[PDB]
Amino acid sequence: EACGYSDRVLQLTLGNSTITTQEAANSVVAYGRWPEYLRDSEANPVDQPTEPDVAACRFYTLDTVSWTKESRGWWWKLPDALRDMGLFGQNMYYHYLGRSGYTVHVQCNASKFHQGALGVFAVPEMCLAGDSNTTTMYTSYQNANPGEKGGTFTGTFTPDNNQTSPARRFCPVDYLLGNGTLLGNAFVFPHQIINLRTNNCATLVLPYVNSLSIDSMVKHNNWGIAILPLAPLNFASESSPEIPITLTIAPMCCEFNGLRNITLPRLQ
Amino acid sequence: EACGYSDRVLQLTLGNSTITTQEAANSVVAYGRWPEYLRDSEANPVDQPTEPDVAACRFYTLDTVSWTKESRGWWWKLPDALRDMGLFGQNMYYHYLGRSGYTVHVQCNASKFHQGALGVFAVPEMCLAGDSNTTTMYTSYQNANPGEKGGTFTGTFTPDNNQTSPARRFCPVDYLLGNGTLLGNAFVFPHQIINLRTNNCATLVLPYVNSLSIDSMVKHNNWGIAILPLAPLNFASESSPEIPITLTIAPMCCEFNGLRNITLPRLQ
Amino acid sequence: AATSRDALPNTEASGPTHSKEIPALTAVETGATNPLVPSDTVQTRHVVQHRSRSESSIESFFARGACVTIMTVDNPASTTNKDKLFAVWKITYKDTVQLRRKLEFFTYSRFDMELTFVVTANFTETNNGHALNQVYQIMYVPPGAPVPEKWDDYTWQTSSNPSIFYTYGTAPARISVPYVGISNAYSHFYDGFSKVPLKDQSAALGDSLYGAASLNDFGILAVRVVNDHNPTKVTSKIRVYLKPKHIRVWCPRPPRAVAYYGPGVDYKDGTLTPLSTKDLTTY
Amino acid sequence: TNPLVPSDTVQTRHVVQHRSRSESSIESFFARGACVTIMTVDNPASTTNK
Amino acid sequence: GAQVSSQKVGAHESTINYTTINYYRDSASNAASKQDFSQDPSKFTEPIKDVLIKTAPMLN
Amino acid sequence: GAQVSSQKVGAHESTINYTTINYYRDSASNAASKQDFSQDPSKFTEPIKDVLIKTAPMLN
Amino acid sequence: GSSST
Amino acid sequence: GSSST
Ligand SMILES: CCCCCCCCCCCCC/C=C\[C@H](O)[C@H](N)CO
Ligand SMILES: *C(=O)CCCCCCCCCCCCC
Ligand SMILES: *C(=O)CCCCCCCCCCCCC
Numbered sequence: 001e002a003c004g005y006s007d008r009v010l011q012l013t014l015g016n017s018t019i020t021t022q023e024a025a026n027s028v029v030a031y032g033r034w035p036e037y038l039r040d041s042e043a044n045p046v047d048q049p050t051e052p053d054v055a056a057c058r059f060y061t062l063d064t065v066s067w068t069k070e071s072r073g074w075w076w077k078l079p080d081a082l083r084d085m086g087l088f089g090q091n092m093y094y095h096y097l098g099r100s101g102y103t104v105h106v107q108c109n110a111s112k113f114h115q116g117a118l119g120v121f122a123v124p125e126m127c128l129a130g131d132s133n134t135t136t137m138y139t140s141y142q143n144a145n146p147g148e149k150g151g152t153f154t155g156t157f158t159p160d161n162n163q164t165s166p167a168r169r170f171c172p173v174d175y176l177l178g179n180g181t182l183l184g185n186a187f188v189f190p191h192q193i194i195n196l197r198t199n200n201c202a203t204l205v206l207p208y209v210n211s212l213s214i215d216s217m218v219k220h221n222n223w224g225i226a227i228l229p230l231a232p233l234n235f236a237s238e239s240s241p242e243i244p245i246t247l248t249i250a251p252m253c254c255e256f257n258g259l260r261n262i263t264l265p266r267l268q
Numbered sequence: 269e270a271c272g273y274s275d276r277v278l279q280l281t282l283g284n285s286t287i288t289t290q291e292a293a294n295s296v297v298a299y300g301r302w303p304e305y306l307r308d309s310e311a312n313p314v315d316q317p318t319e320p321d322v323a324a325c326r327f328y329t330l331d332t333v334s335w336t337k338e339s340r341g342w343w344w345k346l347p348d349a350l351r352d353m354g355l356f357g358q359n360m361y362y363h364y365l366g367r368s369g370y371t372v373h374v375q376c377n378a379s380k381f382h383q384g385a386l387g388v389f390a391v392p393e394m395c396l397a398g399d400s401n402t403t404t405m406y407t408s409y410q411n412a413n414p415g416e417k418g419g420t421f422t423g424t425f426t427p428d429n430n431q432t433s434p435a436r437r438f439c440p441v442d443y444l445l446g447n448g449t450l451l452g453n454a455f456v457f458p459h460q461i462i463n464l465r466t467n468n469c470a471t472l473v474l475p476y477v478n479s480l481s482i483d484s485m486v487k488h489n490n491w492g493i494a495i496l497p498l499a500p501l502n503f504a505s506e507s508s509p510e511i512p513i514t515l516t517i518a519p520m521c522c523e524f525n526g527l528r529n530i531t532l533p534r535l536q
Numbered sequence: 537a538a539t540s541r542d543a544l545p546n547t548e549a550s551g552p553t554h555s556k557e558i559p560a561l562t563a564v565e566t567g568a569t570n571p572l573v574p575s576d577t578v579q580t581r582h583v584v585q586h587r588s589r590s591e592s593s594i595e596s597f598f599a600r601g602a603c604v605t606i607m608t609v610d611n612p613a614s615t616t617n618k619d620k621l622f623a624v625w626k627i628t629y630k631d632t633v634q635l636r637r638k639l640e641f642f643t644y645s646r647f648d649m650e651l652t653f654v655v656t657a658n659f660t661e662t663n664n665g666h667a668l669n670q671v672y673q674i675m676y677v678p679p680g681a682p683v684p685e686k687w688d689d690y691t692w693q694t695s696s697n698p699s700i701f702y703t704y705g706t707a708p709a710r711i712s713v714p715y716v717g718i719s720n721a722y723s724h725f726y727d728g729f730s731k732v733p734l735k736d737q738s739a740a741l742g743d744s745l746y747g748a749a750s751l752n753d754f755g756i757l758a759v760r761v762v763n764d765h766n767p768t769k770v771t772s773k774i775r776v777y778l779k780p781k782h783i784r785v786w787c788p789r790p791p792r793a794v795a796y797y798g799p800g801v802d803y804k805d806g807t808l809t810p811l812s813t814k815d816l817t818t819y
Numbered sequence: 820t821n822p823l824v825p826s827d828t829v830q831t832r833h834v835v836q837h838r839s840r841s842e843s844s845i846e847s848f849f850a851r852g853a854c855v856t857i858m859t860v861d862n863p864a865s866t867t868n869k
Numbered sequence: 870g871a872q873v874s875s876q877k878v879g880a881h882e883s884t885i886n887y888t889t890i891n892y893y894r895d896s897a898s899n900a901a902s903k904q905d906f907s908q909d910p911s912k913f914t915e916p917i918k919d920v921l922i923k924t925a926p927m928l929n
Numbered sequence: 930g931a932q933v934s935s936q937k938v939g940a941h942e943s944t945i946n947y948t949t950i951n952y953y954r955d956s957a958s959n960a961a962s963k964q965d966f967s968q969d970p971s972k973f974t975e976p977i978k979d980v981l982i983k984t985a986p987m988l989n
Numbered sequence: 990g991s992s993s994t
Numbered sequence: 995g996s997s998s999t
Contacts, residue, residue, distance in 0.1 A: 220728030
């Protein structure tokens, strides 16, 4: 626009929170579907839903991670990454059922002299592969659900050989997208790339996706966020560059059914 | 009604909770005002309010107390008595401001051979008198706010003589309504009487009352519930009769403003 | 209104260009693919396009029966020490790999299922005895119904379970089943557990397998030879073919690139190197 | 039996119900062949005593 | 209750048609019609919030 | 003498129909139509002489 | 001829 | 009778 508006400069406001950016590469709406509340024709639990609106549909910033030349990649699951986030988390643990969409904003700035490219992928049902070749489908609830810290990818598969006290965790190999399929094809999932010369952020608007209208948020993650270095970090001629990556995520149109006492999960 | 409807038989439903009664003495709506949300013409904080609706506007049952021949009376403060009640309490501690109305249902059944009468009073700004004659207005936050356990009235004023480590609590004398005014006049406050031969419950619908449209629920209690034996418990010829008293209270039309991190109060 | 068998778009003739319009320049960071066609970057002629995508519609891509299992049964001499073998199979498309890989291009699906049964038998001992023509009973035992413990126990009555009595040497048996999921679609992937581990409960008590939903998702097929024991032993195999008819699919996925290893997405050490050597500047 | 539905005792939302009782009609409940007997016969050598 | 549809005739020797009658009450028993629809790939190829004009800069 | 009825279509790929012709004189030979009716449970759930109003006291 | 339900 | 597509 002749009044200055740009693809690269955006402002997002949800609840009492605002994000600004001056180096965006537009933003993505997964499968072209904006988040919505559950329609009566698709409804299933009959009790009056709780809809926290601004109390939960606001931007929550997770712990900042660090990108280096040896970084193989990071992953988070939703709603798991937000289970301890203010009133969203409370609403989640107090109800049997819950559904939610999300605005995911990945942040990573650097300088005109740095280079590198992060693939930011939102994957529906992001089932990851386990560390075991003695027992399949064995990753424990606690290890499958890291909360906000997330998990990481590895360049090497290493099988858990402790049979007496097994680690019971994922071993997500990066070129296999942590799930036995080639990473070069992950672009069929809703994505953006943070290529440092071009943009300093990724924004993905995710609808609630599932084979059900509503489900157990505590038992099941709907979306996975996978961030992998498609082109490695590099800067000037420093051997050990570092730049931070921050995730800020906002629940959208979230509603909950089946209110009771609060869930107190075994997380360690 | 010729189809059987009665003043004495009621059903109240709020959220996922229902109360029934077969021995009511009608029900009271304090000052004839039903609870309402804050109107735009009276609004003050400008941020979008949180309105938890069914998640918080439901019946919460507090710990049951026991009525005996030596009982002098009990008191609770609102919202304090509900500060730990499910998502109502969460919403309360996450927000600077909050307002709420209530349905208060006091329960106490006995038998056609028992007798006694409980005055159940809802008092706006129920300021109680302290235990000290060395320092006025000295009751600590912790002692002023018992939470759901409430407090009790006494037949005797006894001044705290420990000047080195003062108790800093209320000393609410029953015939003085715990505040220096005669109990026989407490009937100018919205009330009902549970007279065992007549009814087994009291129901008071309380509007949000205050000199402000909204306020700090954590700093300030809007209503006090005072229950005093106007006529003592008696049964057959037993010297030590006991019957339970249960309080169930539901927040109504509650809304909150000023969302931030959660309040973690010093309660002991 | 565009159908799967419609011809694709014609190429329109296009000439030389010198402008500020830059179709060739783009920015994949946005997450979009550049929608170009040849006339955007070269001179084209007019071509009337006749080709269609009819054979790659979701229906056409799946319109084939695939083998999902082989069930073994027998009918021995009455004098044998070993029990007459009847088969029990937990219904699934994950015991074989080809249909599984095709369905797993997608996250969710809906379809009516056609099952076709091919039945073959043979002799085992170097005997010279014969056997009269066998009838097989294929009983569907849904989750909850009594699973047969013996080739001849009461469950084979089938008052309510659906059964097929197949006669050997006749056309392969076939039935259809509706979309029977308890969800609005079949989940090819479930990133979750069927249990929440609670703190107040023991770890064993809160535990469950990763990615597994209903333990008995669809029940079992139980197959037997209905004929009584015969002096000469005959062994038979029932091959089961699954075809997804009337199918819908959602959320595309990269296909399985390393060998399947169990019903989940797990992989085995030593199978993780699908790609072969090829030099960057070698055609 | 008290003819209640959820909106009688809890707060409900509007739901457009699609489920039907088609498979539990008397006809559908019985629409299966059940085994009621097994009859045994034979054909022996002519020389048999039985 | 006969349904009459046309064949897309590939090799040739008017419209040639074929006939279909459903024999069963349950639609699950029906054959596949193969009368299927196509859609535009945009939800996967162009999932961006602001519409893309291919002659224009993707970033402005 | 053909009877044409509609299928309730569950999974999808207008009204889809199917056709039925009875081949025999005896109705006992016919297949089951499954075109069945429902009724209200009242003769079992509310067999009381005075009509029950659920918001009212059952005993008055 | 044809009945229709 | 007959539908026609
Ligand atoms: C007389 C034989 C009757 C046979 C009846 C078979 C009924 C059971 C149908 C099973 C449907 C299997 C569909 C495939 C698998 C699921 O997609 C995934 N694991 C997700 O739910
Ligand atoms: C619509 O179907 C009316 C025309 C009927 C044409 C002849 C039907 C051929 C035989 C169908 C038998 C019924 C199948 C159960
Ligand atoms: C009504 O039935 C008139 C239409 C006839 C359609 C063709 C009938 C198909 C063959 C039926 C043979 C008779 C069965 C004994």
